[PDB]
mmCIF file of N, CA and C in Angstrom:
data_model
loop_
_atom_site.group_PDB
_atom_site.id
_atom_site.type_symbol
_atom_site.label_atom_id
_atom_site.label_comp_id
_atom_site.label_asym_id
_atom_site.label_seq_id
_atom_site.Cartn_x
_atom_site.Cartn_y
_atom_site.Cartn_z
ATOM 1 N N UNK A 1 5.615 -42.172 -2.439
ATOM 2 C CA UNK A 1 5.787 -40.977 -3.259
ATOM 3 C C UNK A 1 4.574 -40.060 -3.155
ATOM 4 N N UNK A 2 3.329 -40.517 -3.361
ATOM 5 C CA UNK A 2 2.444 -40.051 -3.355
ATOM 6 C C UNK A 2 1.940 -39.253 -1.751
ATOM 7 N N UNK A 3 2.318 -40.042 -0.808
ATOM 8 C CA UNK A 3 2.035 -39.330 0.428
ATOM 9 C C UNK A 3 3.298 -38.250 0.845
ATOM 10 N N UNK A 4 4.148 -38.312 0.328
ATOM 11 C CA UNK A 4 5.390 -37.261 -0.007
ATOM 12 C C UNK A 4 4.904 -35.881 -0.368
ATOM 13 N N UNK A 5 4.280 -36.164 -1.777
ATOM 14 C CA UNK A 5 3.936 -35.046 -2.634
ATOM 15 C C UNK A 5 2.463 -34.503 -1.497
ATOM 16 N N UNK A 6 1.486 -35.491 -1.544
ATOM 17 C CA UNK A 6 0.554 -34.841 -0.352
ATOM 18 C C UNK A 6 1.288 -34.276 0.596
ATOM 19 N N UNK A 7 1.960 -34.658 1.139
ATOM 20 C CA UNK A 7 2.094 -33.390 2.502
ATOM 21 C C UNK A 7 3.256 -32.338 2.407
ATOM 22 N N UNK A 8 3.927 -32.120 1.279
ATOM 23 C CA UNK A 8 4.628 -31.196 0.418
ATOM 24 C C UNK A 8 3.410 -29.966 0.020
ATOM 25 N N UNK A 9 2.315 -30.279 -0.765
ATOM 26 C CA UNK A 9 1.276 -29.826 -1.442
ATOM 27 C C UNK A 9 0.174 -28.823 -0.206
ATOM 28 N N UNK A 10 0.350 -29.648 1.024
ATOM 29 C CA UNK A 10 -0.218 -29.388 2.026
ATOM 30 C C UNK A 10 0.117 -28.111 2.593
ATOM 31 N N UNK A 11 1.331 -28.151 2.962
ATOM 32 C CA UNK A 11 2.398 -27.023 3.630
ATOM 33 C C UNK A 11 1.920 -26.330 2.836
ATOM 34 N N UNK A 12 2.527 -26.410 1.423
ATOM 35 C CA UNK A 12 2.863 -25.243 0.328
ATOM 36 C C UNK A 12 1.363 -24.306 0.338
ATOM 37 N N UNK A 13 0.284 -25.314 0.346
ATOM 38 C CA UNK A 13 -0.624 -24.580 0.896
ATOM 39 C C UNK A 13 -0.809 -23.362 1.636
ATOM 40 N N UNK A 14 -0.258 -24.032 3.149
ATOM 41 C CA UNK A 14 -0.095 -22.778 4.125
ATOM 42 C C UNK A 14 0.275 -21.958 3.847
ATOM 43 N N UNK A 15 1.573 -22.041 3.865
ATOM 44 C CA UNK A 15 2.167 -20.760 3.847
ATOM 45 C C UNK A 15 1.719 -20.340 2.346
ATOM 46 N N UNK A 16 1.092 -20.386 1.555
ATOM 47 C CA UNK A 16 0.536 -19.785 0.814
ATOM 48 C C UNK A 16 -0.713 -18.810 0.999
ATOM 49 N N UNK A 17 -1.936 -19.335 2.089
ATOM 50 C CA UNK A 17 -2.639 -18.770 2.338
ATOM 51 C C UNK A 17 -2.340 -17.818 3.394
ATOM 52 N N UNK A 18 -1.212 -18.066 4.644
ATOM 53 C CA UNK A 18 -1.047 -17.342 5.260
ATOM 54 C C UNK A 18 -0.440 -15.879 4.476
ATOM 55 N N UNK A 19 0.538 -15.657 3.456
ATOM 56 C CA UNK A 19 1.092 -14.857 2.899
ATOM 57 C C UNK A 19 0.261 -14.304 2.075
ATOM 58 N N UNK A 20 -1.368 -14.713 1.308
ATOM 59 C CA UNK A 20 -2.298 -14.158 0.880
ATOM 60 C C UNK A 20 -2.839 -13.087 1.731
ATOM 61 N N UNK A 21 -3.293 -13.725 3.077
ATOM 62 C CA UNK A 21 -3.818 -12.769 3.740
ATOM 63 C C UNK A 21 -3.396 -11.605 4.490
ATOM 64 N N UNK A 22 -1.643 -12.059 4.783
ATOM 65 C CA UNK A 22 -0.681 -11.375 5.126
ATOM 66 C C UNK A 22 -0.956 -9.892 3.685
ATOM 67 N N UNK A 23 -0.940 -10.121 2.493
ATOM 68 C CA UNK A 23 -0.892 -9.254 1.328
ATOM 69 C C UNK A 23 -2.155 -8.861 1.420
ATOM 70 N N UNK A 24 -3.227 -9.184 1.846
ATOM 71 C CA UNK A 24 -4.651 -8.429 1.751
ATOM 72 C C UNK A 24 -4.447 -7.390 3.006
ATOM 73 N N UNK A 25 -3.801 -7.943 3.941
ATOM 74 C CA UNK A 25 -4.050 -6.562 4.930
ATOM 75 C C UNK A 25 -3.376 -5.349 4.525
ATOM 76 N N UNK A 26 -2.203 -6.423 4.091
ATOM 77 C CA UNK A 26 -1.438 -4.986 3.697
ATOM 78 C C UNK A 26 -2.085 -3.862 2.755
ATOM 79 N N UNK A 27 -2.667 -4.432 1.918
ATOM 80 C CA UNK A 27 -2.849 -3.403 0.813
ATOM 81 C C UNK A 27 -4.470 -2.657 1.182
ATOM 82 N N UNK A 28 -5.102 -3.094 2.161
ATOM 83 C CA UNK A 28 -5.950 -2.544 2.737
ATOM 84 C C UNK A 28 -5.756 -1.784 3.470
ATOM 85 N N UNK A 29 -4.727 -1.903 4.585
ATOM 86 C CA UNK A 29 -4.032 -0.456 5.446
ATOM 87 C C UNK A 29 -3.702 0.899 4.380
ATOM 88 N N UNK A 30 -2.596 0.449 3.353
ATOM 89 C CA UNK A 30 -2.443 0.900 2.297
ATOM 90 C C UNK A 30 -2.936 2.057 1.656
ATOM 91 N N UNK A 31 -4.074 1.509 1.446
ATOM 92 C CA UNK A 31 -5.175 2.292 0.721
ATOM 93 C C UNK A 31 -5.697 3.311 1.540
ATOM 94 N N UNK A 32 -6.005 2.618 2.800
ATOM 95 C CA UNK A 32 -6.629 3.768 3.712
ATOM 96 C C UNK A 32 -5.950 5.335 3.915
ATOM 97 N N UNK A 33 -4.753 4.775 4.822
ATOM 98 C CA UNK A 33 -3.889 5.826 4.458
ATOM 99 C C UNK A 33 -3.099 6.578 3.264
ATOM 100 N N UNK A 34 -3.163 6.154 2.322
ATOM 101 C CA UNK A 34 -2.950 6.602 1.084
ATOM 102 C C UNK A 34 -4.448 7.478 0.967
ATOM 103 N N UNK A 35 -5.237 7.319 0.856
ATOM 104 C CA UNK A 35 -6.620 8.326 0.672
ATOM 105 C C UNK A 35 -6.394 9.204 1.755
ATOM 106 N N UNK A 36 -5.945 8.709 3.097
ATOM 107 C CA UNK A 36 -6.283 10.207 4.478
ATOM 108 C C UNK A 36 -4.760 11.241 3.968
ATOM 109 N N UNK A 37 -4.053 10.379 3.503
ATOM 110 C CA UNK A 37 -3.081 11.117 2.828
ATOM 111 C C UNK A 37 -3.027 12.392 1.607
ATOM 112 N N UNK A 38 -3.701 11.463 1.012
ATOM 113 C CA UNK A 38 -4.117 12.691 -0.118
ATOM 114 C C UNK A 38 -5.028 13.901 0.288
ATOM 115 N N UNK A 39 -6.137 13.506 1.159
ATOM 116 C CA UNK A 39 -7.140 14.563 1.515
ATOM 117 C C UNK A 39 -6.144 15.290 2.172
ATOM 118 N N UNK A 40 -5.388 14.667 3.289
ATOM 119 C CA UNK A 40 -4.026 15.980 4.387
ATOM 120 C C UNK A 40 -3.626 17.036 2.823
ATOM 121 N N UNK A 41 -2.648 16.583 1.832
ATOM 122 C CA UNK A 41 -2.300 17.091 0.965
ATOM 123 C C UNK A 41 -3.080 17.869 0.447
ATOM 124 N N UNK A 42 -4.685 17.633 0.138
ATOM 125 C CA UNK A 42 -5.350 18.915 -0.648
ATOM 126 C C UNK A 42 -5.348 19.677 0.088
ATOM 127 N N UNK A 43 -5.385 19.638 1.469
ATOM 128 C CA UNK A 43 -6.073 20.925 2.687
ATOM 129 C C UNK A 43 -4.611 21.252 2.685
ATOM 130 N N UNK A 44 -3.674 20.961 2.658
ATOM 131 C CA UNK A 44 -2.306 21.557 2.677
ATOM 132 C C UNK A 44 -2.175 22.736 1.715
ATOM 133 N N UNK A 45 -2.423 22.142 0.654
ATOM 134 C CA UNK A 45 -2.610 22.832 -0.619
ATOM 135 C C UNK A 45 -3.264 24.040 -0.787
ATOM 136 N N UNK A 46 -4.183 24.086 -0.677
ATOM 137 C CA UNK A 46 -5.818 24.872 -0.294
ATOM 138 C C UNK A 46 -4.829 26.021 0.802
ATOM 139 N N UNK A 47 -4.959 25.651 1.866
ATOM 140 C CA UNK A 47 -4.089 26.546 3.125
ATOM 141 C C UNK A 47 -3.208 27.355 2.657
ATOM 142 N N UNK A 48 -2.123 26.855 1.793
ATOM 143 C CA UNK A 48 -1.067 27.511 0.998
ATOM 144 C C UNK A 48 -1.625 28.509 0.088
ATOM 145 N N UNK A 49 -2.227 27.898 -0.451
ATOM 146 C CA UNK A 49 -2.455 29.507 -1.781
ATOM 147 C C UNK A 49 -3.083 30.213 -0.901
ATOM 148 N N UNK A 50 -4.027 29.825 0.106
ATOM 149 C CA UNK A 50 -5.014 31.186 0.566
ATOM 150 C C UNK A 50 -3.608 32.086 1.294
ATOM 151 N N UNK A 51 -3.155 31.885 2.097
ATOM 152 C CA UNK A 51 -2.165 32.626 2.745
ATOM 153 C C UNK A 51 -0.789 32.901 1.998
ATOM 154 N N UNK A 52 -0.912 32.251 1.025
ATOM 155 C CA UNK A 52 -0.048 33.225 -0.289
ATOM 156 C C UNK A 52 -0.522 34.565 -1.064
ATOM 157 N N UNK A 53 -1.639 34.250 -1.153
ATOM 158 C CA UNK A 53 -2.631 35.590 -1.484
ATOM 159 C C UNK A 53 -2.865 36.888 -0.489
ATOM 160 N N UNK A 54 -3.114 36.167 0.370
ATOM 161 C CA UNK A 54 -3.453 37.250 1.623
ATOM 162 C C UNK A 54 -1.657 37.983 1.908
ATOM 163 N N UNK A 55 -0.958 37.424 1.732
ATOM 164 C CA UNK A 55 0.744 37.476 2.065
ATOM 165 C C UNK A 55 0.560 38.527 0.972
ATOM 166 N N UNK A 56 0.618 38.330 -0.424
ATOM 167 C CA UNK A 56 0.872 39.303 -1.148
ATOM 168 C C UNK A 56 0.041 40.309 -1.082
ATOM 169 N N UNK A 57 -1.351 40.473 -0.267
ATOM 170 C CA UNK A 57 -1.713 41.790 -0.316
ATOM 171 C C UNK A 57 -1.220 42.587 1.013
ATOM 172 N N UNK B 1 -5.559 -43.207 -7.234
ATOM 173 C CA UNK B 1 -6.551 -41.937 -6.591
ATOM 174 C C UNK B 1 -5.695 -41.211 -5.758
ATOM 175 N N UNK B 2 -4.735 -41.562 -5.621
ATOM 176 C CA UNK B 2 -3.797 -40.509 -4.934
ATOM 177 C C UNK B 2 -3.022 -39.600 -6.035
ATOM 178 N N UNK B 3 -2.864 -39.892 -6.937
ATOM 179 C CA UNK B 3 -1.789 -39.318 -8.384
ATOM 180 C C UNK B 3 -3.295 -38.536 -8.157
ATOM 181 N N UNK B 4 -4.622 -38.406 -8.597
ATOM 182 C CA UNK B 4 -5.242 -37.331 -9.142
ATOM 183 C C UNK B 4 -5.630 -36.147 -8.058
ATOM 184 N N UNK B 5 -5.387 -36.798 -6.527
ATOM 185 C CA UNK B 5 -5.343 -35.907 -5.644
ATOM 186 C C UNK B 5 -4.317 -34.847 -5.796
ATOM 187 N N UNK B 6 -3.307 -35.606 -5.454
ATOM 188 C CA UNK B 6 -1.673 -34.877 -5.506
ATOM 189 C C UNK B 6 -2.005 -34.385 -6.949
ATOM 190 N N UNK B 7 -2.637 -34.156 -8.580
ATOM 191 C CA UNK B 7 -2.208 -33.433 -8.778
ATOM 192 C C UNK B 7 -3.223 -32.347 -8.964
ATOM 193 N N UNK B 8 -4.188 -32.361 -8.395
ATOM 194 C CA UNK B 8 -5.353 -31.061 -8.092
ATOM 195 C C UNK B 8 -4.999 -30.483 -7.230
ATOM 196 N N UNK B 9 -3.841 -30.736 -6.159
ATOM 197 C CA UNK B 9 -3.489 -30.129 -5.319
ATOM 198 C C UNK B 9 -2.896 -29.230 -5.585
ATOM 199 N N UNK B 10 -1.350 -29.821 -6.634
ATOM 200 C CA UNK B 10 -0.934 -29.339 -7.012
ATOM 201 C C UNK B 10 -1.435 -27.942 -7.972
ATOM 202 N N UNK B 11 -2.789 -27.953 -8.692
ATOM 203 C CA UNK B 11 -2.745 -27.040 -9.822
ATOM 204 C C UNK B 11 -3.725 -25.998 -8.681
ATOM 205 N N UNK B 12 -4.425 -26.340 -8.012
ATOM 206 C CA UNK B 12 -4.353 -25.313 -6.639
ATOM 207 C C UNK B 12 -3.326 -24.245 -5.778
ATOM 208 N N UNK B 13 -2.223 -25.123 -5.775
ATOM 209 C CA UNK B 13 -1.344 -24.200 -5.166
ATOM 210 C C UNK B 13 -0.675 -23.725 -5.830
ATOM 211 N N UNK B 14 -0.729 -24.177 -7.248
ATOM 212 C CA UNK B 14 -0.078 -23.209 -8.207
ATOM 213 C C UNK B 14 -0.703 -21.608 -8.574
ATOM 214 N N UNK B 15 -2.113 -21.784 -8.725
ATOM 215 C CA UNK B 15 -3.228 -20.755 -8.546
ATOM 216 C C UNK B 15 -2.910 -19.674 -7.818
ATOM 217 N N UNK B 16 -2.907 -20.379 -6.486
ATOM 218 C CA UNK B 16 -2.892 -19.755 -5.564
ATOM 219 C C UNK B 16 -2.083 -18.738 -5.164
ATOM 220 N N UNK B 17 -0.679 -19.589 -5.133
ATOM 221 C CA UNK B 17 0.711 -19.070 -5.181
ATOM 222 C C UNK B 17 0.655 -17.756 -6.035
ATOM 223 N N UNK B 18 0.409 -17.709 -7.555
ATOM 224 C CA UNK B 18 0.302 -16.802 -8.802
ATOM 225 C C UNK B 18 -0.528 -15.403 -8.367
ATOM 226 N N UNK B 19 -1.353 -15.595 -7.825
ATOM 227 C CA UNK B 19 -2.406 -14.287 -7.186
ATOM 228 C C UNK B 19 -1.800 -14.169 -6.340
ATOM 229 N N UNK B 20 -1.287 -15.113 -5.144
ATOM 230 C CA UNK B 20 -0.718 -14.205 -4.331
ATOM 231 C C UNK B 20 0.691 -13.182 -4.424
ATOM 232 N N UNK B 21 1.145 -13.412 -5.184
ATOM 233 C CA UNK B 21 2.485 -12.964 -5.666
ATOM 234 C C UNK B 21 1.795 -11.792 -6.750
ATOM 235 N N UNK B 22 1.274 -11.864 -7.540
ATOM 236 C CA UNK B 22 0.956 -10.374 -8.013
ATOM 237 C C UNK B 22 0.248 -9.129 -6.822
ATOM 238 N N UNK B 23 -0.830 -10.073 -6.324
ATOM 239 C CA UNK B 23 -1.517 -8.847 -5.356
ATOM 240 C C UNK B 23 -0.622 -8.617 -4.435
ATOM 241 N N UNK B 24 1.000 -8.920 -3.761
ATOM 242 C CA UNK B 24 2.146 -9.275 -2.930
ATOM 243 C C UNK B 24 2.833 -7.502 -4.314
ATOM 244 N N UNK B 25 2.847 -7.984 -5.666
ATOM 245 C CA UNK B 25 3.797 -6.568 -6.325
ATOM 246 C C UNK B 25 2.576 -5.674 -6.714
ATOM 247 N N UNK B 26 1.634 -5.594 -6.372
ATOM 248 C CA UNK B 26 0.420 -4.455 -6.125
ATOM 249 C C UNK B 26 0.325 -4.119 -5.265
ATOM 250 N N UNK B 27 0.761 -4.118 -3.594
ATOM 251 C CA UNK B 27 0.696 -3.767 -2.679
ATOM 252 C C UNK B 27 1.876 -2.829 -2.608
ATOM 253 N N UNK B 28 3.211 -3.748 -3.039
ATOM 254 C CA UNK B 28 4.435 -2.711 -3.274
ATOM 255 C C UNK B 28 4.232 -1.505 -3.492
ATOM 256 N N UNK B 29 3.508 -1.759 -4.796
ATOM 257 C CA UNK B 29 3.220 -0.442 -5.936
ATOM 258 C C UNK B 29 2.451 0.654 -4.497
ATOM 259 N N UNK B 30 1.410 0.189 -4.145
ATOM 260 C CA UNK B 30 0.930 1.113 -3.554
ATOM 261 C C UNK B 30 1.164 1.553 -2.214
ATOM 262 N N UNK B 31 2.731 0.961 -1.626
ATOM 263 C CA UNK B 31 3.460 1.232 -0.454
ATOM 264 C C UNK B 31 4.083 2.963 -0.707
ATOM 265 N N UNK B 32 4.763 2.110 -2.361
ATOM 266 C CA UNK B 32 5.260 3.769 -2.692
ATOM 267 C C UNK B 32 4.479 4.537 -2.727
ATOM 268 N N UNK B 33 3.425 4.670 -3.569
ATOM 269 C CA UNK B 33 2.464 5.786 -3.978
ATOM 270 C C UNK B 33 1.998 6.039 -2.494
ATOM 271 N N UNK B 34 2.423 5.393 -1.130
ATOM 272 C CA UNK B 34 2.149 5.897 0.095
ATOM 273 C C UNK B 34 2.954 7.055 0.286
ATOM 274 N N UNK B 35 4.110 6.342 0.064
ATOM 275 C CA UNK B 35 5.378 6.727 0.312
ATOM 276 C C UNK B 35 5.671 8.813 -0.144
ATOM 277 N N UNK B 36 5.527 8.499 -1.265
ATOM 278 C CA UNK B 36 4.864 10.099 -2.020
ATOM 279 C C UNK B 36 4.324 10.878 -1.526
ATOM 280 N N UNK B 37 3.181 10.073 -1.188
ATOM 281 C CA UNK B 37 1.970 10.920 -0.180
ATOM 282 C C UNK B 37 2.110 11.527 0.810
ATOM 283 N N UNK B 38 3.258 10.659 1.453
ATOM 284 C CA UNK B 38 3.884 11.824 2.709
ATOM 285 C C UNK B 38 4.421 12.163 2.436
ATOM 286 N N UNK B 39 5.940 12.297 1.354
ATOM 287 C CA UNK B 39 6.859 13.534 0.895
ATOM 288 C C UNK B 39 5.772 14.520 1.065
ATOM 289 N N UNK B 40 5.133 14.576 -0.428
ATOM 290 C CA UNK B 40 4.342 15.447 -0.817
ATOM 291 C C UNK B 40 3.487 16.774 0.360
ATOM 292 N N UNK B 41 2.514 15.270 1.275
ATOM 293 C CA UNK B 41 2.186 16.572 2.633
ATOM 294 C C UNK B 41 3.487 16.678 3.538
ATOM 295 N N UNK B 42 4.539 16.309 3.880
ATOM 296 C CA UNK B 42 5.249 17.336 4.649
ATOM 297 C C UNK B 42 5.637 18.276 3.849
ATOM 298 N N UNK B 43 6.151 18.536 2.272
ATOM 299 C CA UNK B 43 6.402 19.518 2.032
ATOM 300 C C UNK B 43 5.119 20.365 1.708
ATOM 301 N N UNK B 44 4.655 20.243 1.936
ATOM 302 C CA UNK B 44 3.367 21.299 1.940
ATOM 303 C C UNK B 44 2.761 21.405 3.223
ATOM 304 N N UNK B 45 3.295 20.836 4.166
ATOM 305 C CA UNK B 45 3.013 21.807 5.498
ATOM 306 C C UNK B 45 4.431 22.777 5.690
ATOM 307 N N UNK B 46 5.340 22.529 5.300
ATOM 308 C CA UNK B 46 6.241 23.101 5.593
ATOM 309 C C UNK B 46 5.961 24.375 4.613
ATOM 310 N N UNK B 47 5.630 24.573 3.454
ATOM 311 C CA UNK B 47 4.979 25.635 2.754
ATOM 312 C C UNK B 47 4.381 26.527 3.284
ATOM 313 N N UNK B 48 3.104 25.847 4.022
ATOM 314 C CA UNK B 48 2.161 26.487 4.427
ATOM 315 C C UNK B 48 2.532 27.419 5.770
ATOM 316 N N UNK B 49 3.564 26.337 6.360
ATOM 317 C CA UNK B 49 4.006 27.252 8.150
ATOM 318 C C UNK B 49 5.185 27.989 7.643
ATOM 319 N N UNK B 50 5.890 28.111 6.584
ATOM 320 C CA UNK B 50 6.653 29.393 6.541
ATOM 321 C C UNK B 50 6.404 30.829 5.900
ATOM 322 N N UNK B 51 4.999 30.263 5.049
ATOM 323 C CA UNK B 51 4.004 31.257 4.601
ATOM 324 C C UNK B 51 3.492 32.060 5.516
ATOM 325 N N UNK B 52 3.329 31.268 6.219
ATOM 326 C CA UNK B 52 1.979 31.731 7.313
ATOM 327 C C UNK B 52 3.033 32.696 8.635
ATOM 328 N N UNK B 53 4.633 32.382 8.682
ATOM 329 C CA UNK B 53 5.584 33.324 9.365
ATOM 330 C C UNK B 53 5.804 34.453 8.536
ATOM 331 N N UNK B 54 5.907 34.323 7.615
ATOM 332 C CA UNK B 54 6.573 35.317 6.508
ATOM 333 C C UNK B 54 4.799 36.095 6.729
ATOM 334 N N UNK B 55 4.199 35.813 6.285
ATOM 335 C CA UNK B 55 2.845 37.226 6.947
ATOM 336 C C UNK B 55 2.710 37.570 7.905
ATOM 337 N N UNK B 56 2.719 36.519 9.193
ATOM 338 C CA UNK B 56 3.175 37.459 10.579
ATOM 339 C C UNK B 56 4.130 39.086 10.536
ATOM 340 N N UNK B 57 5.324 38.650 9.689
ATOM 341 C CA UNK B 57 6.284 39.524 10.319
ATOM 342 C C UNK B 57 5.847 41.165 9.391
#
C-alpha cells in the first residue's frame, strides 16, 4: 500500500511541477506583452487627438 | 516510516497543486486583459489612419 501511495505521490508531483512552470511562463510572456501593449495604445492615442486637432483646423 | 513519508508527500502535493491552480486562474485573468489590449490598439490605429485620410483630402 504504502509503495502504491509513494509512487502515486511521485507522479502527482510531476506533473504538478511541470504545469507550475508551464503557468509561470505563461504569465510572464503575458505581462510583457500586455505592457508593450498598452504603451502601442497610448502612442495610438496621443497620434489621434494630435491629428484630430490639426483636422479641425 | 513509510505512512509518514507517504503522508508529507502527500501534504506537499497538495500545496503545490493549490498555487499552481490559482497562479494557472491569474494567468487567465491576464490572457484577457491581453486580449483587450489588442481590441483596444487596433481600434485606435484604425482611428488614427482614417483621421490622418480624412486630413489628406
Amino acid at each position: 500500500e504504502a509503495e502504491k501511495a509513494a509512487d502515486e505521490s511521485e507522479r502527482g508531483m510531476k506533473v504538478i511541477e511541470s504545469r507550475a512552470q508551464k503557468d509561470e511562463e505563461k504569465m510572464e510572456i503575458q505581462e510583457i506583452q500586455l505592457k508593450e501593449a498598452k504603451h502601442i495604445a497610448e502612442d495610438a492615442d496621443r497620434k489621434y487627438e494630435e491629428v484630430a486637432r490639426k483636422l479641425v483646423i
